[PDB]
Amino acid sequence: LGKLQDVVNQNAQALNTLVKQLSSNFGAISSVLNDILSRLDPPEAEVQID
Amino acid sequence: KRISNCVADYSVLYNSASFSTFKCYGVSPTKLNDLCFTNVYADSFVIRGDEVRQIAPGQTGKIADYNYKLPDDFTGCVIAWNSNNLDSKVGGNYNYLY
């Protein structure tokens, strides 16, 4: 079945891509927000968090 | 220097009340104390009084560009102090190079 399978595969792939989006830095020095907070002071690391 | 398989605290390295300057571009000693790091490095050298200004992420000059370049994502601490009573002597101390 093609019609019933596309509506599930597309949603699952969109959810997977949403998960993948958290693995990118978006031009920052780290991906996870805890690492920059642990390694840099919050007054200076505001740009990366923003 | 490489720090591995060693547990310690930075509180002793701060309450000496003898360091003239303190430039940790990263986190407060306490901030980097509460969390757990994997490895710590130590780069020790000597420098003049007019060149401590240039040791900062995002500055130019003749020492920060030709001897040790500081990257933008520099999360380390810089601890500097005066010990001119031991590493200098009368007649001209020229043992240090740059």
Angle at the Cα of B97 from the Cα atoms of B94 and B98, rounded to 5 degrees = 140
Gap between the Cα atoms of A38 and B31, Å rounded: 7
- Residue A38 touches chain B, beta carbons under 8 Å: yes
- Chain B residue numbers touching A29 (CB-CB < 8 A): 72-73
Q: How far is CA B32 from the centre of its chain?
A: 16
How far apart are the C-alpha atoms of B75 and A40, rounded to whole Å?
Answer: 6
CB B41, CB B91: distance < 8 Å: no
The structure was resolved to a resolution in Å of 4.0
The answer, for B25 touching chain A at a CB cutoff of 8 Å, is: yes
- The alpha-carbon gap from A23 to the nearest alpha carbon of chain B, in Å, equals 18
**Coil, helix or strand for A15?**
helix
Give the minimum alpha-carbon distance from A31 to chain B in angstroms, rounded to a whole number.
Answer: 13
